[PDB]
């Protein structure tokens, strides 16, 4: 049941009349007309300076999501909560899972060239004008999506829209600007090495989906520098950056006004034309990888595949199981059965990483580098009992999950990212009220069913840090098989 999109047609307008609607903006202050100074001098803050003309009777705003679409295929969705700071975001369905051996690193290059020179605005004037407006903006690359975002006072929205859309409409990709960005392109993975949690996650993906789809790396390598030229970049955008593969989202904006200015950004110039692409299905292989590094702890992670991912039909069941075990709390299964019964364990948790059509689920532990063999035995024992929960554990997990959902959605940023991410992966937005109804219908049999299916494929093992006593690949596999995994 997809949402019904309202049509916003292209219209030709007189330029001089549209300029009467652009918000005021100043970069220079050549003198000042007002000469009254601080009229509130000497008045302390325990006393009010407002007048009756400043009082109003409150009228709540329109907080439901409204939907619209342009004629070029761009989908638009916005909501207003009455705040004064707006969040804006442009989501593109063009992540690292679409790269090949001749392209590895191109999506990371496009992220680091965000807000560079365009056909109607230079790099310096773009980043300098955003700062002077008091806004923050950036670009984030992922495995399935690329996102451009900005936050600013809600009266500056018309000024920020073109500086976001220009990156996908008419970037120039000048040689001397590419040569000035090549430095920050390598320092990413170098900065990633000294971040253990992020390194364990990367190793988990590269090992789960060997050389395909979700297993490609996020950042560039020294090899990638062999194809860092404008023609390769421009060829990638022509295959993936059409309006039909993009969604725009705003929070704390007027819906009708956002549609008008988005229509005006696309009316006079030609966008990248559509193209039919076939999405290859991921191939899960599992395996094992080690990475020795100076560290006082032995990091260890073990995971399995989740069939179907976000659209597999059992998303809510894996999120309830995660809550029972314990995530990033003092009555979770991992705090009572593992941490309290072993003083040499520094931490432990469960993770659940889901994508459009595949995901992984597993455990992650730090421990004393001299007891890695025992760390493997305890993890295997927990996997052996995952398919059994009591009524008290299950009921306490549901209540904890519902509260987290509603509480997360109090923040502007999270709401924006959730709405845009859902419309690219499923063309529908599931409300928190529908999540609750689904959470309440999870049974004990469902848990036991999804754990068994999870164990029908090989595992994915990762070790990081001091791995001097980590058993051999065959011994980890055998320990799991003795606990019934």
């Amino acid at each position: 049941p997809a949402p019904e999109y309202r049509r916003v047609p292209f219209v030709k307008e007189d330029m001089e009349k549209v300029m009467e609607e652009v918000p005021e903006f100043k970069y220079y202050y050549v003198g000042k007309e007002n000469t009254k100074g601080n009229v509130y001098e000497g008045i302390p803050l325990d006393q009010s300076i407002l007048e009756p003309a400043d009082l109003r009777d409150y009228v709540p705003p329109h907080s439901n999501i409204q939907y619209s679409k342009l004629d070029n295929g761009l989908r638009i969705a916005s909501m207003d909560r009455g705040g004064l700071t707006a969040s804006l975001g442009l989501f593109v369905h063009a992540g690292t899972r679409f790269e090949d051996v001749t392209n590895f690193g191109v999506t990371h290059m496009i992220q680091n060239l965000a807000f560079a020179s365009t056909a109607h605005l230079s790099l310096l004037r773009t980043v300098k004008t955003i700062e002077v407006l008091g806004a923050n903006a950036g670009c984030v690359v992922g495995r399935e999506h690329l996102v451009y975002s900005a936050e600013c006072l809600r009266s500056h929205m018309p000024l920020l829209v073109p500086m976001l859309t220009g990156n996908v409409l008419f970037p120039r990709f000048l040689p001397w600007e590419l040569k000035a960005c090549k430095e920050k392109l390598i320092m990413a993975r170098k900065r990633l090495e000294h971040m253990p949690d992020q390194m364990v996650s990367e190793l988990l993906h590269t090992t789960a989906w060997h050389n395909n789809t979700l297993g490609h790396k996020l950042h560039c390598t020294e090899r990638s520098l062999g194809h860092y030229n404008p023609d390769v970049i421009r060829h990638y955008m022509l295959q993936h950056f059409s309006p039909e593969n993009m969604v725009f989202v705003g929070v704390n904006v007027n819906h009708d006004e956002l549609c008008t200015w988005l229509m005006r950004a696309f009316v006079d110039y030609n966008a990248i034309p559509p193209s039919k692409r076939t999405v290859a299905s991921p191939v899960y292989t599992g395996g094992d990888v080690r990475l020795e590094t100076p560290s006082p702890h032995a990091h260890m992670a073990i995971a399995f595949e989740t069939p179907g991912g976000w659209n597999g039909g059992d998303l809510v069941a894996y999120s309830v199981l995660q809550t029972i075990l314990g995530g990033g709390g003092m009555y979770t299964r991992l705090y009572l059965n593992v941490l309290n019964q072993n003083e040499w364990v520094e931490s432990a948790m469960a993770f659940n990483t889901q994508y459009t059509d595949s995901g992984i689920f597993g455990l992650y532990m730090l421990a004393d580098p001299t007891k890695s063999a025992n760390a493997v035995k305890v993890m295997a024992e927990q996997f052996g009992k995952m398919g059994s929960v009591t009524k008290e554990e299950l009921q306490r997990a549901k209540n904890s999950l519902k509260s987290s959902i509603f509480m997360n959605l109090e923040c502007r940023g999270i709401v924006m990212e959730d709405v845009g991410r859902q419309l690219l992966m499923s063309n529908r937005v599931i409300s928190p009220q529908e999540f609750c109804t689904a959470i309440d219908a999870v049974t004990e049999a469902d848990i036991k069913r999804v754990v068994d299916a999870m164990y029908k494929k090989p595992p994915t093992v990762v070790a990081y840090g001091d791995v001097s006593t980590v058993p051999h690949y065959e011994e980890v596999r055998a320990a799991l098989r003795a606990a019934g995994v």
Binding site: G31, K32, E33, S122, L124
Partner: protein, 192 residues
């Protein structure tokens, strides 16, 4: 508040310029007055025929013969000590940069010997503007920087960090910051 009154005058003249600024290209107005554009057109047939005309033609012959004697192009005469032209040279592609390097080497050698090239090595047009696309892009880059960063006289710490404090960024280029060290072996700013 005497500063706020002066600011009101600046602001009035500022708003007047803006309210009378066009929103599209409009040709610039003629500089010379009508009285001056009438005397010139009346004396033109005689002034141009016997003086200004031959002056223009002698000038281009003098320039062409000197450049061709040395194997040079007109655009080779500009210096890299101009900030605009320095930026333009940084934007050149390899093939054009190599040919300029070679012509400049050959012209210094010929001026040292004071020997003409043969006539058959002079058969070329020296007035082709091969630098123009790069000069106009350089002007655009540096006009942006000046308008966005250089619109005010900024203060700074004086005689600190190797610079004077009045705007210089490269160290040791003014006499009052000469001689940075008394002991040691010194160093290069390019190796920091």
């Amino acid at each position: 508040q005497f500063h706020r009154e002066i600011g009101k005058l600046f602001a009035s003249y500022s708003n007047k310029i803006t309210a009378n600024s066009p929103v599209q290209y409009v040709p610039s107005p003629p500089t010379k007055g009508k009285v001056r554009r009438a005397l010139s057109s009346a004396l033109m047939p005689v002034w141009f025929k016997f003086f200004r005309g031959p002056l223009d033609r002698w000038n281009l012959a003098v320039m062409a013969k000197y450049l061709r004697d040395h194997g040079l192009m007109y655009d080779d005469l500009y210096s890299d000590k101009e900030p605009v032209f320095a930026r333009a040279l940084e934007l050149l592609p390899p093939d054009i940069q190599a040919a300029r390097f070679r012509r400049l080497m050959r012209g210094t050698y010929l001026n040292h010997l004071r020997l003409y090239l043969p006539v058959h090595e002079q058969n070329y047009d020296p007035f082709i503007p091969y630098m123009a696309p790069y000069v106009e892009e350089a002007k655009f880059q540096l006009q942006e920087e000046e308008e966005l960063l250089g619109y005010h006289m900024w203060e700074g710490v004086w005689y600190s960090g190797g610079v004077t404090g009045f705007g210089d960024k490269e160290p040791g280029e003014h006499f009052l910051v000469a001689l940075p060290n008394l002991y040691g072996a010194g160093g290069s700013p390019m190796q920091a």
